[PDB]
């Protein structure tokens, strides 16, 4: 879905690179680890910069794993992560990039929004929507919906996947609900509000059937009950919103289906507070009343979610891409400055060590 200019790797290919044989750097780090000493972030940077084959991808994965489990794990630089993803894309190794991203705890791969978009768009161009969905779920887990381009791409992929899905496991419901709620909150349009409603409906179903811990545990979600109430609040907000904002009929149908299905371990809640299973009938009545109110106000959209998201993508992704490319160029310049400072520090330390050794 992204332009060739956004996906172009020429400027990254033109980065100033100091050439090494990957075997030499690997042996140096092996000696360092054997001596139980810390490895510099510059060394791992040089190894990742000097991947020249698909087997060097396999070796660099192992050395990333070893660096993550070392005293200087925190110092893995952003340009190194970007280069790792670029190399994986270059040598037809998207599966390895996805593997490291999924096991980010073991490898320390925490991409920026540009790098997420690169990976997700590669998967989308190859029509591998399953892996694109995996990348979207990783973006959700990392809470990286701060850039509009990522939000739009994630919404597109999510609605594409939901358009052809019937069987829902509660983990799948939880992941889909979170991944649609987070970008839906940052988009103040009809698509964003419909995504908010759909995700709140899914999370409320998960909460009522499996419990609130199933919702918030190891998720970027809050531990407060009342997700269905928040969906109804989204409907209420749309009712008092300007003319242009609307709600897709599909999201309303999903919420209605969830309520119709719901109305047919440690206790974390105070016994004086009313449970959700007891407020289901009132939620249903509120849903029917608000649905009639929205239908009267003409705040219901008949277009499907996927088509509406496609149209929004076509309208906004170009300007989002322009902004992202500008920020990416700024980042590359700053990274070059930082890398040259690191190289100078190493050279100065080595020369001072030689000066001392000469005595």
């Amino acid at each position: 879905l992204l332009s060739s200019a956004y996906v172009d790797s020429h400027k990254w290919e033109a980065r100033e690179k100091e050439h090494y044989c990957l075997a030499d750097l690997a042996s140096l780090m092996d000696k360092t680890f054997e001596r139980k000493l810390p490895v510099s972030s510059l060394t791992i940077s040089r190894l990742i910069d000097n991947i020249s084959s698909r087997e060097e991808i396999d070796h660099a994965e192992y050395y990333l794993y070893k660096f993550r489990h070392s005293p200087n794990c925190w110092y893995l630089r952003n340009w190194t992560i970007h280069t790792w993803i670029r190399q994986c894309l270059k040598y037809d190794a998207q599966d390895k990039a996805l593997y490291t991203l999924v096991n980010k705890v073991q490898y320390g791969i925490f991409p920026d929004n540009f790098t997420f978009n690169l990976l997700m768009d590669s998967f989308i161009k190859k029509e591998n929507y399953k892996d694109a969905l995996s990348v979207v779920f990783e973006v959700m887990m990392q809470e990286a919906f701060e850039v509009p381009s990522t939000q739009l791409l994630s919404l597109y992929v999510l609605f594409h996947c939901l358009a052809k899905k019937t069987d829902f496991s509660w983990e799948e419901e939880r992941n889909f609900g979170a991944s649609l709620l987070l970008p839906g909150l940052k988009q103040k349009n009809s698509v964003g509000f419909s995504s908010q409603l759909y995700g709140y409906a899914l999370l409320g179903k998960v909460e009522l059937q499996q419990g609130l811990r199933a919702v918030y545990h190891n998720m970027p979600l809050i531990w407060k009950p009342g997700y269905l109430d928040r969906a109804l609040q989204v409907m209420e907000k749309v009712a008092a919103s300007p003319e242009d904002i609307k709600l897709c009929r599909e999201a309303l149908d999903v919420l209605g289906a969830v309520l119709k299905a719901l109305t047919s371990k440690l206790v974390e809640q105070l016994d004086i507070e009313e449970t959700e299973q007891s407020k289901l009938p009132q939620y249903l009545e509120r849903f029917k009343a608000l649905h009639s109110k929205l239908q009267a106000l003409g705040k219901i959209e008949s277009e499907g979610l996927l088509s509406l998201t496609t149209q929004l993508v076509k309208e906004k992704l170009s300007t989002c891409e322009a902004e992202d490319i500008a920020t990416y160029e700024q980042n590359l310049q700053q990274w070059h400055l930082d890398l040259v400072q690191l190289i100078q520090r190493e050279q100065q330390q080595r020369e001072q060590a030689k000066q001392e050794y000469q005595a």
Partner: protein, 211 residues
């Protein structure tokens, strides 16, 4: 005095061997969830913790899944959420992960504390990092989570003296000629009663010795 040099030699060797064979957090604070015992020492955890140990997460079990180990993020605790209605949390400023951990789920952390809505001036080390009691505040919820309106905290400024001590104070006053009728009072405004679950000084806390 005949010198005792073997004692000094043994003390120095023991100090060196303790500083070189230090047990790591991944070893000290590992837990067998089936039996709820520490494999390092074999001691069983207290009963009141068992459920939490099987449901909640350690702090770096959360921080290892975040960029920069979650610097600047807000982390709260389940016990604080249950006990207190006002927001209690840490704003992280520095993290030292235990690289020897297989999942990088052990380590140390520093941050700025807000307890019951009162933020501290400086950042200090976080205690109970190894407890299974930690939750991560979502970015889109922070504004709602952090919101707090300071209620008027007007408490007693003075209390009566105990009966016999009051009687003795008054008797001494009348002995020294004073005839004023004001009741003796104990000022209690400078005695601030700190909640028992307020975070303590982790820098002053000890560490389990290797064995």
């Amino acid at each position: 005095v005949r010198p005792r040099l073997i004692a000094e030699l043994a003390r120095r060797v023991r100090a060196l061997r303790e500083q070189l064979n230090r047990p790591r957090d991944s070893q000290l604070y590992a837990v067998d969830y089936e039996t709820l015992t520490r494999p390092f020492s074999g001691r069983r955890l207290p009963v009141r913790a068992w459920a939490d140990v099987r449901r909640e997460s350690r702090l770096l079990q959360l921080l290892g899944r975040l960029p920069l180990f979650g610097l600047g993020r807000l982390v709260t605790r389940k016990s604080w959420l249950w006990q207190h209605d006002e927001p209690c949390y840490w704003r992280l400023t520095r993290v030292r992960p235990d690289y020897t951990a297989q999942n990088l789920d052990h380590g140390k952390a520093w941050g700025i504390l807000t307890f019951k809505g009162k933020t501290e001036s400086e950042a200090r080390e976080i205690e109970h990092v190894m407890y299974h009691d930690w939750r991560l505040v979502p970015k889109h919820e922070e504004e709602a989570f952090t919101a707090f309106t300071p209620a008027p905290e007007d408490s007693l400024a003075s209390v009566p003296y105990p009966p016999l001590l009051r009687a003795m104070i008054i008797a001494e006053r009348q002995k020294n000629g004073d005839t004023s009728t004001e009741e003796p009072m104990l000022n209690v405004q400078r005695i601030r009663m700190e909640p028992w679950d307020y975070p303590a000084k982790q820098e002053d806390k000890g560490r389990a010795k290797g064995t």
